[PDB]
Paper text:
The structural studies and enzymatic assays presented here demonstrate that PmMOR is able to accommodate diverse substrates within its active site, to catalyse the reduction of aldehydes and carbon-carbon double bonds and to perform reductive cyclisation reactions to form the iridoid backbone. Each monomer of the protein folds into two domains, a Rossmann domain that binds NADP(H) and forms much of the active site cavity and a largely α-helical capping domain.
It is likely that the size of the pocket allows for significant movement of the ligand, and the observed density is an average of multiple conformations. By contrast, our data and model favor a conformation where the steroid is flipped 180° when compared to the previous models. This conformation fits the difference electron density much better as demonstrated by the higher correlation coefficients (CC with the difference map 1.75x higher for the flipped conformation) than the best fit from Thorn et al. and avoids a steric clash with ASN-205 which occludes part of the binding pocket in PmMOR. While progesterone was poorly utilized as a substrate by PmMOR based on very low specific activity, the enzyme was able to reduce progesterone to 5ß-dihydroprogesterone, even though this compound is not found in P. major and is thus not a physiological substrate. Interestingly, P. major does not have the cardenolide progesterone pathway, however the enzyme is able to accommodate this non-physiological substrate and perform the reduction reaction.
Author numbering: 26 to 389
The structure:
Amino acid sequence: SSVALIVGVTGIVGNSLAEILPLADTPSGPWKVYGVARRPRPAWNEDNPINYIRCDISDPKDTQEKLSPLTDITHVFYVTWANRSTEVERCEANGKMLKNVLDVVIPNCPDLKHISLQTGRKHYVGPFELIGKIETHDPPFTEDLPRLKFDNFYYTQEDLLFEEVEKKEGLTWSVHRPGNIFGFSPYSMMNLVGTLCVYAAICKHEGKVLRFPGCKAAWDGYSDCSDADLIAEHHIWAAVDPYAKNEAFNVSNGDVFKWKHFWKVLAEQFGVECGEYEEGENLKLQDLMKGKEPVWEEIVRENGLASTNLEDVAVWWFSDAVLDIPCPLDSMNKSKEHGFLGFRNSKNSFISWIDKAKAYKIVP
Ligand SMILES: NC(=O)c1ccc[n+]([C@@H]2O[C@H](COP(=O)([O-])OP(=O)(O)OC[C@H]3O[C@@H](n4cnc5c(N)ncnc54)[C@H](O)[C@@H]3O)[C@@H](O)[C@H]2O)c1
Ligand SMILES: CC(=O)[C@H]1CC[C@H]2[C@@H]3CCC4=CC(=O)CC[C@]4(C)[C@H]3CC[C@]12C
């Protein structure tokens, strides 16, 4: 039987992996699940049969401390990251985080079969600062085209992973590059759905219109996204399928959409009146929601929500970052040609993840 390690279990995809791995019908199930994180176990992670572990993977001592006793690990799911001012600092911080984990697991786990590493569609468009500013390859992005000639901590992590798996015969790897992730995790540093839900709940409480905080290309152009549960199934599939070993795969829901339509979905789900894209405005939730923490705590008590601080639940800079730029699509041909036929209805996923945030009483 298989034993999984989820590096970043309170994450947006780690929480999906924590919910799906111990399922009875999950491939290679039953699954024993260790889940690594720093914070204490929150309230939306409590009803899963997961063996929680508190550890800062940037500290090589706590990583040797907490992970050396773990003997039975068969598969590893690295699904965390760290943000810094420049991309060079992200290469250093995230390379060391992945290295500390692998230095421990590979020798101290005799049955280690697979390591799956989650990167992203930034692999193709470049780091945050350079996005829209550098000549990329032409979309839709395919997995095995040359890397951009710029720094990128996805590149740094991939090279590291390739060297580390060599230290064990029959050790095998996979990397998964999702688009914007539709999922549920209040602790996530990039939870787009949760951020858009809070902005809709604040527009509702104030009687103001849900205005689009982005550009016309995100409003009127084609967009796609990656469902968190679908990314989890994508990890598990590559972890257990030997015809997907040592390969990089995109993972997106399989359909496109326009935030023009999704806005009315978001508007319908919170009772707000849908606003349209206003030209020559360039509205930023980071600016628009400045100093609105009292309004949030007013919403929380008036709707019996869970005790949440606006900063944790809404990452305005991320939301602004995604809606201010056009959406270049990726291709799911390589995954489908290797036998992964999973998919999601992006509209239904959006509603589904909105309703999960409502269900856990994070938004009204
Ligand atoms: N969030 C997104 O929308 C998004 C979309 C595309 C690709 N990505 C890529 O997915 C990968 C993972 O992102 P995410 O968004 O799933 O993560 P996340 O922010 O949603 O959650 C990360 C998880 O790891 C844990 N954690 C963070 N710091 C830690 C540390 N120092 N030590 C141990 N654990 C730690 C957190 O507690 C959290 O549980 C990243 O490389 C990201 O580039 C994310
Ligand atoms: C709808 C949209 O604007 C999305 C589609 C492709 C997405 C970008 C490319 C993929 C992506 C992944 C990340 O983890 C950081 C933000 C970026 C860089 C995304 C920001 C928002 C974009 C541009």
